[PDB]
Write a protein that binds this ligand. Structure first.
Ligand SMILES: *[C@@H]1O[C@H](CO)[C@@H](O)[C@H](O)[C@H]1NC(C)=O
Ligand SMILES: *[C@@H]1O[C@H](CO)[C@@H](O)[C@H](O)[C@H]1NC(C)=O
Ligand SMILES: *[C@H]1O[C@H](CO)[C@@H](O)[C@H](O)[C@@H]1O
Ligand SMILES: *[C@H]1O[C@H](CO)[C@@H](O)[C@H](O)[C@@H]1O
Ligand SMILES: *[C@H]1O[C@H](CO)[C@@H](O)[C@H](O)[C@@H]1O
Ligand SMILES: *[C@H]1O[C@H](CO)[C@@H](O)[C@H](O)[C@@H]1O
Ligand SMILES: *[C@H]1O[C@H](CO)[C@@H](O)[C@H](O)[C@@H]1O
Ligand SMILES: *[C@H]1O[C@H](CO)[C@@H](O)[C@H](O)[C@@H]1O
Ligand SMILES: *[C@H]1O[C@H](CO)[C@@H](O)[C@H](O)[C@@H]1O
Length: 363
């Protein structure tokens, strides 16, 4: 049951990790009352992805897989879900990056060690199907942000590191999905082909890895999956939702050598449409959002393997504190909820917002 054919989401149930469940029960619930905290308890049972944003997060991955092995040894049929996110000079186009490795200070070698560490864990838990999202906010920058010096200089490192990750994690119990931005980034007509070309090149350059199932879209973003009317901030783009995006880029990938590419789409913060975004490019702790379509493989779509919740709702995108290190001005915009703590830290007011605006509702 660890190995699979076709859609890796079919035949298993994604695991709802203890890490996120702890945050909800210990940081959120003690502050909620009645209907609200009962609804919060339910959110903790919805499976979401765990982010390995630092090397010191790897022991947590092993800990999670141990829990799953027991659950399965205890009759479960669960699969792990993780995000590989520690590229050197990470988020090259961002005003502030929390990435621990730098290309200038042997970041490529450090990244390979990080991948070697993850591989050993996956080989150790060969009995568990592991679903992985590979490096969000990486390759998309190579399509539109080469005008930014940091991205231009990180191009070779990004491609070398991604090749290593994809080849070293190419195992029977693994299913990988390369991050491919979203409709508002690569969905624009002029960006579709250049993007398809790059992703197809990465695939073929890694010798068409069996484990590389396809692409992941809308990660940590808020686009709707199949909304019938275009939000004002999408003006000028015919591809205004994720469904239109994957169906546009799908055939293009085939034209470039990558046939049979499938997709997964983040809907964890897409429940309320339109959102409170004043501009499509606004990504930090956006106001007017809610939990969206629940994770499921019954997508009613030919290209979507599953709806997923990659970015865990409640965990901060970045701080709004100007006197704080790693401060990004995008988190201080009128459509960003404030005050916001450090990236990854629990953001209670944001969690309550998502819970209140949820669709399907939890209340
Ligand atoms: C192909 O793989 C090599 C490493 O073997 C890497 O250096 C190169 O950047 C990759 N090229 C592309 C287009 O992915
Ligand atoms: C959008 O997708 C959801 C989930 O598959 C479905 O319930 C809904 O009917 C769809 N709406 C439209 C307009 O296609
Ligand atoms: C998935 O594939 C493995 C071998 O790669 C088999 O042992 C298993 O039964 C399933 O077919
Ligand atoms: C996880 O749990 C679901 C129940 O919704 C099963 O259908 C699946 O086979 C796995 O055991
Ligand atoms: C359970 O785990 C979460 C995530 O680390 C903590 O925030 C919480 O305090 C508890 O230890
Ligand atoms: C944290 O713990 C509480 C109480 O056990 C649960 O209700 C919640 O779902 C989460 O697991
Ligand atoms: C959240 O963390 C607290 C300890 O800080 C636990 O008591 C609780 O059960 C949950 O794991
Ligand atoms: C729950 O959230 C409240 C804020 O509404 C905090 O005061 C409390 O410490 C807990 O984090
Ligand atoms: C939500 O509902 C549950 C079930 O009655 C309660 O235990 C909780 O206190 C909240 O009111």
């Amino acid at each position: 049951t660890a190995t699979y054919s076709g859609n890796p989401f079919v035949g298993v149930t994604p695991w709802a990790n203890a890490y996120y469940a702890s945050e909800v029960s210990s940081l959120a619930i003690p502050s909620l009352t009645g209907a609200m905290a009962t609804a919060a308890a339910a959110v903790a049972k919805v499976p979401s992805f765990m982010w390995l944003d630092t090397l010191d997060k790897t022991p947590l991955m092993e800990q999670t897989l141990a829990d799953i092995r027991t659950a399965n040894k205890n009759g479960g049929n669960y699969a792990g879900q993780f995000v590989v996110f520690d590229l050197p000079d990470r988020d090259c186009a961002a005003l502030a990056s929390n990435g621990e490795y730098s290309i200038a200070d042997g970041g490529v070698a450090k990244y390979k060690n990080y991948i070697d560490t993850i591989r050993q864990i996956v080989v150790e838990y060969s009995d568990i199907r592991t679903l992985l999202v590979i490096e969000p906010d990486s390759l998309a920058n190579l399509v539109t942000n080469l005008g930014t010096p940091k991205c231009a200089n990180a191009q070779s490192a990004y491609l070398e590191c991604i090749n290593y990750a994809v080849t070293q994690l190419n195992l029977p119990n693994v299913a990988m999905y390369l991050d491919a931005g979203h409709a508002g980034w690569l969905g624009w007509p002029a960006n579709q082909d250049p993007a398809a070309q790059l992703f197809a090149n990465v695939y073929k350059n890694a010798s068409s890895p069996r484990a590389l199932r396809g692409l992941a879209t809308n990660v940590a973003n808020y686009n709707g999956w199949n909304i019938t009317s275009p939000p004002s901030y999408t003006q000028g783009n015919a591809v205004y939702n994720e469904k239109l995006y994957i169906h546009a880029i799908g055939p293009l990938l085939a034209n470039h050598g990558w046939s049979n590419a499938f997709f997964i789409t983040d809907q964890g913060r897409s429940g309320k449409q339109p959102t409170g975004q004043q501009q499509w490019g606004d990504w930090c702790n956006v106001i007017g959002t809610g939990f969206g379509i629940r994770p499921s493989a019954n997508t009613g779509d030919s290209l979507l393997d599953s709806f997923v919740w990659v970015k865990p709702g409640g965990e901060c995108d970045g701080t709004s504190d100007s006197s704080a290190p790693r401060f990004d001005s995008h988190c201080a915009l009128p459509d960003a909820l404030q005050p916001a703590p450090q990236a990854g830290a629990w953001f209670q007011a944001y969690f309550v917002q998502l819970l209140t605006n949820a669709n399907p509702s939890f209340l």
